[PDB]
Scaffold this active site. Sequence first.
Site, PDB file in Angstrom:
ATOM      1  N   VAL A 184       0.780  -1.282  -0.062  1.00  0.00           N
ATOM      2  CA  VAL A 184      -0.225   0.000   0.140  1.00  0.00           C
ATOM      3  C   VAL A 184       0.639   1.164  -0.014  1.00  0.00           C
ATOM      4  O   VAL A 184       0.630   2.405  -0.751  1.00  0.00           O
ATOM      5  CB  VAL A 184      -1.030  -0.040   1.104  1.00  0.00           C
ATOM      6  CG1 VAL A 184      -1.883   1.361   1.079  1.00  0.00           C
ATOM      7  CG2 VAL A 184      -1.936  -1.170   0.826  1.00  0.00           C
ATOM      8  N   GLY A 221       3.725   1.946  -1.228  1.00  0.00           N
ATOM      9  CA  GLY A 221       4.375   2.012  -2.409  1.00  0.00           C
ATOM     10  C   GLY A 221       3.445   2.429  -3.694  1.00  0.00           C
ATOM     11  O   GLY A 221       3.752   3.101  -4.423  1.00  0.00           O
ATOM     12  N   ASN A 237       6.764  -4.890  -9.135  1.00  0.00           N
ATOM     13  CA  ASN A 237       6.643  -5.671  -7.877  1.00  0.00           C
ATOM     14  C   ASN A 237       7.026  -7.022  -7.964  1.00  0.00           C
ATOM     15  O   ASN A 237       6.800  -7.519  -9.006  1.00  0.00           O
ATOM     16  CB  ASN A 237       4.958  -5.596  -7.155  1.00  0.00           C
ATOM     17  CG  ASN A 237       5.043  -6.206  -5.724  1.00  0.00           C
ATOM     18  OD1 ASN A 237       5.674  -5.703  -4.665  1.00  0.00           O
ATOM     19  ND2 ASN A 237       4.351  -7.251  -5.688  1.00  0.00           N
ATOM     20  N   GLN A 271      10.059  -4.147   2.153  1.00  0.00           N
ATOM     21  CA  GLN A 271      10.381  -4.254   3.280  1.00  0.00           C
ATOM     22  C   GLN A 271      11.934  -4.009   3.564  1.00  0.00           C
ATOM     23  O   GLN A 271      12.831  -4.320   2.900  1.00  0.00           O
ATOM     24  CB  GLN A 271      10.217  -5.859   3.453  1.00  0.00           C
ATOM     25  CG  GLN A 271      10.342  -6.290   5.075  1.00  0.00           C
ATOM     26  CD  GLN A 271      10.326  -7.866   5.100  1.00  0.00           C
ATOM     27  OE1 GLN A 271       9.300  -8.597   5.670  1.00  0.00           O
ATOM     28  NE2 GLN A 271      11.669  -8.400   4.727  1.00  0.00           N
ATOM     29  N   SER A 299       6.776  10.256   5.849  1.00  0.00           N
ATOM     30  CA  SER A 299       5.887   9.993   7.029  1.00  0.00           C
ATOM     31  C   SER A 299       4.521  10.507   6.596  1.00  0.00           C
ATOM     32  O   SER A 299       4.369  11.218   5.680  1.00  0.00           O
ATOM     33  CB  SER A 299       6.373  10.958   8.073  1.00  0.00           C
ATOM     34  OG  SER A 299       5.666  10.976   8.955  1.00  0.00           O
ATOM     35  N   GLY A 300       3.558  10.103   7.469  1.00  0.00           N
ATOM     36  CA  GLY A 300       2.094  10.368   7.094  1.00  0.00           C
ATOM     37  C   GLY A 300       1.033   9.304   7.022  1.00  0.00           C
ATOM     38  O   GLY A 300      -0.096   9.365   6.693  1.00  0.00           O
ATOM     39  N   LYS A 350      14.114  10.788  10.041  1.00  0.00           N
ATOM     40  CA  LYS A 350      12.899  10.086   9.998  1.00  0.00           C
ATOM     41  C   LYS A 350      12.843   8.918  11.303  1.00  0.00           C
ATOM     42  O   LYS A 350      11.594   8.958  11.777  1.00  0.00           O
ATOM     43  CB  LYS A 350      12.871   9.068   8.815  1.00  0.00           C
ATOM     44  CG  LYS A 350      11.851   8.148   8.806  1.00  0.00           C
ATOM     45  CD  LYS A 350      10.529   8.520   9.021  1.00  0.00           C
ATOM     46  CE  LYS A 350       9.395   7.301   8.972  1.00  0.00           C
ATOM     47  NZ  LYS A 350       7.822   7.369   8.860  1.00  0.00           N
ATOM     48  N   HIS A 388      11.680  11.407  13.958  1.00  0.00           N
ATOM     49  CA  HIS A 388      10.345  11.545  13.801  1.00  0.00           C
ATOM     50  C   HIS A 388       9.470  10.349  14.595  1.00  0.00           C
ATOM     51  O   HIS A 388       8.703  10.561  15.420  1.00  0.00           O
ATOM     52  CB  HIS A 388      10.014  11.575  12.537  1.00  0.00           C
ATOM     53  CG  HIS A 388       8.615  11.643  12.467  1.00  0.00           C
ATOM     54  ND1 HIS A 388       7.794  10.562  12.029  1.00  0.00           N
ATOM     55  CD2 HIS A 388       7.595  12.528  12.341  1.00  0.00           C
ATOM     56  CE1 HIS A 388       6.438  10.772  11.884  1.00  0.00           C
ATOM     57  NE2 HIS A 388       6.222  12.059  12.194  1.00  0.00           N
ATOM     58  N   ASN A 389       9.993   9.082  14.352  1.00  0.00           N
ATOM     59  CA  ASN A 389       9.212   7.831  14.747  1.00  0.00           C
ATOM     60  C   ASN A 389       9.304   7.641  16.238  1.00  0.00           C
ATOM     61  O   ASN A 389       8.514   7.333  16.887  1.00  0.00           O
ATOM     62  CB  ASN A 389       9.504   6.647  14.042  1.00  0.00           C
ATOM     63  CG  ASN A 389       8.774   6.630  12.720  1.00  0.00           C
ATOM     64  OD1 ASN A 389       8.365   7.563  12.022  1.00  0.00           O
ATOM     65  ND2 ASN A 389       8.618   5.250  11.973  1.00  0.00           N
ATOM     66  N   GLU A 410       7.145  10.125  17.885  1.00  0.00           N
ATOM     67  CA  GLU A 410       5.764   9.733  17.603  1.00  0.00           C
ATOM     68  C   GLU A 410       5.598   8.508  18.842  1.00  0.00           C
ATOM     69  O   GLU A 410       4.280   8.764  19.221  1.00  0.00           O
ATOM     70  CB  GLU A 410       5.887   8.890  16.242  1.00  0.00           C
ATOM     71  CG  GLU A 410       4.490   8.364  15.679  1.00  0.00           C
ATOM     72  CD  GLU A 410       4.667   7.088  14.693  1.00  0.00           C
ATOM     73  OE1 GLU A 410       4.768   7.777  13.495  1.00  0.00           O
ATOM     74  OE2 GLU A 410       4.717   6.131  14.660  1.00  0.00           O
ATOM     75  N   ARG A 453       5.852  -0.324  25.454  1.00  0.00           N
ATOM     76  CA  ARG A 453       5.307  -1.328  24.286  1.00  0.00           C
ATOM     77  C   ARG A 453       5.845  -2.590  24.802  1.00  0.00           C
ATOM     78  O   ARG A 453       5.002  -3.572  24.521  1.00  0.00           O
ATOM     79  CB  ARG A 453       5.789  -0.740  22.832  1.00  0.00           C
ATOM     80  CG  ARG A 453       5.254   0.388  22.246  1.00  0.00           C
ATOM     81  CD  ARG A 453       5.274   0.453  20.741  1.00  0.00           C
ATOM     82  NE  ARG A 453       4.968   1.775  20.583  1.00  0.00           N
ATOM     83  CZ  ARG A 453       4.574   2.052  19.199  1.00  0.00           C
ATOM     84  NH1 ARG A 453       4.750   1.172  18.157  1.00  0.00           N
ATOM     85  NH2 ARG A 453       4.264   3.291  18.849  1.00  0.00           N
ATOM     86  N   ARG A 465      32.603   5.047  41.852  1.00  0.00           N
ATOM     87  CA  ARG A 465      33.510   4.430  40.621  1.00  0.00           C
ATOM     88  C   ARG A 465      35.006   4.630  41.006  1.00  0.00           C
ATOM     89  O   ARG A 465      35.770   3.974  40.714  1.00  0.00           O
ATOM     90  CB  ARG A 465      33.227   5.406  39.358  1.00  0.00           C
ATOM     91  CG  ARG A 465      31.847   4.813  38.965  1.00  0.00           C
ATOM     92  CD  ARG A 465      31.528   5.706  37.421  1.00  0.00           C
ATOM     93  NE  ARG A 465      32.369   5.080  36.365  1.00  0.00           N
ATOM     94  CZ  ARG A 465      33.288   5.822  35.942  1.00  0.00           C
ATOM     95  NH1 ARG A 465      33.612   7.142  35.862  1.00  0.00           N
ATOM     96  NH2 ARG A 465      33.818   5.161  34.731  1.00  0.00           N
ATOM     97  N   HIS A 501      38.522   5.180  38.844  1.00  0.00           N
ATOM     98  CA  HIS A 501      38.214   5.433  37.381  1.00  0.00           C
ATOM     99  C   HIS A 501      38.534   6.985  37.288  1.00  0.00           C
ATOM    100  O   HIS A 501      38.408   7.658  35.893  1.00  0.00           O
ATOM    101  CB  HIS A 501      36.595   5.174  37.266  1.00  0.00           C
ATOM    102  CG  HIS A 501      36.481   3.726  37.030  1.00  0.00           C
ATOM    103  ND1 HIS A 501      37.050   3.018  35.821  1.00  0.00           N
ATOM    104  CD2 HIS A 501      35.655   2.986  37.542  1.00  0.00           C
ATOM    105  CE1 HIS A 501      36.684   1.870  35.988  1.00  0.00           C
ATOM    106  NE2 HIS A 501      35.795   1.780  36.841  1.00  0.00           N
TER     107      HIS A 501
END
Lengths: 470, 470
Positions: free
Chosen positions: A13, A15, A33, A75, A128-129, A184, A187-188, A191, A289, A447, A453
Amino acid sequence: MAQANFGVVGMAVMGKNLALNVESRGYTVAIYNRTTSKTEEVFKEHQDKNLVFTKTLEEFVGSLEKPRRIMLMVQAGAATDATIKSLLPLLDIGDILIDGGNTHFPDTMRRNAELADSGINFIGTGVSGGEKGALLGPSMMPGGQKEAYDLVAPIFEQIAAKAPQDGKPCVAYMGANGAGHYVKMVHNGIEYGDMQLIAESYDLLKRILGLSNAEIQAIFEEWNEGELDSYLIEITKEVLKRKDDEGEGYIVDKILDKAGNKGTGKWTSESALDLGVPLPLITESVFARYISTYKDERVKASKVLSGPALDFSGDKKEVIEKIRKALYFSKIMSYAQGFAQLRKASEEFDWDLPYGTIAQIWRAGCIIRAEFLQNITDAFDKDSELENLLLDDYFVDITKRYQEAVRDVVSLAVQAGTPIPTFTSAISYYDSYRSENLPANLIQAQRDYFGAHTYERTDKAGIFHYDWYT
Amino acid sequence: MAQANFGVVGMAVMGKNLALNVESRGYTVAIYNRTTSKTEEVFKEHQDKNLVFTKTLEEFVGSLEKPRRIMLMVQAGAATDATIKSLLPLLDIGDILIDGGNTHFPDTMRRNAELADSGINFIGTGVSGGEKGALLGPSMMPGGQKEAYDLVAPIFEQIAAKAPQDGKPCVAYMGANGAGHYVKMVHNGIEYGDMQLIAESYDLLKRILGLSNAEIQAIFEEWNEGELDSYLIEITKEVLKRKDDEGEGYIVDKILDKAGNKGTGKWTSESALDLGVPLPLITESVFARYISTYKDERVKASKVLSGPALDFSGDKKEVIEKIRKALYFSKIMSYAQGFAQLRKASEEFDWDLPYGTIAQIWRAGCIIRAEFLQNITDAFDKDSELENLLLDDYFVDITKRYQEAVRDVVSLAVQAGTPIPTFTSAISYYDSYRSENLPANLIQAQRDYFGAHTYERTDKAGIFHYDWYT
Ligand SMILES: O=C(O)[C@H](O)[C@@H](O)[C@H](O)[C@H](O)COP(=O)(O)O
Ligand SMILES: O=C(O)[C@H](O)[C@@H](O)[C@H](O)[C@H](O)COP(=O)(O)O
Ligand SMILES: C[As](C)(=O)[O-]
Ligand SMILES: C[As](C)(=O)[O-]
């Protein structure tokens, strides 16, 4: 042969819709395709349009104008490498492959380098969109060779969404090699953070205040008329309208609470980790998630683990307003974090990213499209070198005024036992960022104690080690 | 020639102390370092000991018994690859290289595979306990070929710390290839988390309750006599004793609040992200270090951004106890998260990790050594297949009883404006883990709305897409 102006490989879809977007701007578009059946389904449904049906890769390439402009919409990962490998021998030097997939940026950096060795231009572009945006007007984030970008920019500027403020196309040159897929990816990331923030607000309204989908829908509708105005709140109140297509009530309530992901948010957090950049909010969103993914375990834990009992003693209308304030405040925390990441990345990979323009091209077309993106572009207009959005006067003021409400929401939610991992990281980030001194002195002491350190001092230059033992 | 029983490459302190540890168990140890001067400094200071001084790599190898046992204690990354490359041509098939460095596990997986091609055994081992632990008794986490491990185990069992509970050596076979460096990476992840938890407790006692280093030291001392008993709290109260070596007051107060890191905590978080594992606490800890790194920006932000004014209205003694409870509760959240990561990793890389034994070997020697590690080993004794520590009866009870206090501490801190990123992620994780239903249904709805990503249902099997538009 050489009749089509532009080509799209990948008739899923995204593409397909992109091919249709380009065609609708007055170009002829060759479509290809891997499995021929899908190309035939597209072609027949859109026979009226100026689409060139191709069944072989040579037929696809042969149908394109030099220098050829071919957009890959397949993909991500191995399928994209396979398509490139299939195309490479059929191309001529100067041709332009464009990868519009959600590709991890280091693959774009690798792809750009190796394709340059063959004299082929490679433009890794974020699109995006969603499926509707790809058709009607995406936000686009292209990176690669400037000269090659300039050749594709006319078409990109036509298919992209226009900002409602000034009608500027939501596409611009991000920088070299992987710069566009990086933007991008951010962006995500952002999102994920917004969706998690909206999920918590929804959860608070639903569990603490006992409100209905209709009630919450009306709240989000009202919110979206104000400063919160955004596409994500818009589709939220829209989702909350819809009936179950296979039973009683609403579709949202029948959807299993296991958030999927396709990598970009994870990659954002992985990059922040690499770069030394604090990105708690978007990262908590990713982890939120993951924990929803642990549904079976969560079911078991619900029966074993105890929490507080909920009786809400407050005023609904004013708590709703506090949550509104906390949502906006928290978005500011996350974008602040996100733009600081873009800043460190720009330095790391030498991209000289246009921070204000990135803000500008997110004003429409993209998923995170919102009115307050104009505010972010204004902050960078004032100071292109701005280190953090929170040091801009517009955001200083909002945080000054909305923080009391956030603290109240955090307290309420925590005492009620409603999980607010991003609201809590939002306020934690704010109180850390604004602290002149943080307890990291003790961390450095430990440390140096166990690992020798070394540390720096508050009172003089140089590197020191303390004799903790003798 | 063939006089030494064991060899150490890398005469920085860790490698020197380890060479000395081995020697002190009644072995002869060949020592080598890239820059000859350091080997001479070690040898002369420890002439009484059974150390074989070597100046060339062939002299080092030539001095060892077949099959040779060589431990590498050099800088991680390219320096370790360089040492391996330098050693390889001088070795015979069957020889055993051991990498005791803090190596990122995928490098160990790569190193194991390529060294096997040459007939050389490779044991990637985590070594925990700092410079003093390396000398007196580390916790050790070896992975690689079992047959090769069995040949080195006698020495490892002698040099390692013994658990005070049952005198068991704090070393065991973790599994194949990178399994040991993975466990070590998780150890250090958990370490970051504990240090951050302790930093927040320190910050709360210092900023909300206005307590002094002497007061806080006494609090940590008392805490360490109870269930919190751990090495990290021990060195915390110890660090808080020490005077400034170059001025008035305490050394802790002159240390610049910019936490360093050498990668392991970052790698833990990166791995959780890869695996689909929720690891918020340790990740917030990493990000807490990163934000302390942003000192210059924090200084600027302190002058611009506003917070609440602090006047503490409560009882010191009882708030101290709430913080104590919140610390213990939060550690449980983090270890719970950490062991769930080890579980998913074990499945991903086919390591069949011994979770209960991992707990057992952390009871002494390592930095996270604590009495409550016995509780974790008991949970796995009951159920080796236990999905999450929180479903064990000991931890169910603690969380039931300590959560009210955590909620109070979170509210207090948030209203006071003290940053508590890990205390807040601790309670958020708890309330998420125990929720049968999470607002991820809305997230899935939005994803299906804009991206057609599909969802599962609460009421039937199968994968679904909703007609959001028509
Ligand atoms: O900006 C967009 O148009 C979307 O973000 C798009 O890139 C796609 O929907 C991805 O799948 C990301 O979302 P997920 O990682 O949640 O799948
Ligand atoms: O277990 C240990 O003995 C230490 O953790 C050890 O591995 C070393 O001290 C590292 O440097 C980790 O700590 P940093 O990442 O904070 O440097
Ligand atoms: C200076 As060091 C002990 O971190 O190598
Ligand atoms: C099923 As899909 C739109 O995530 O490829």
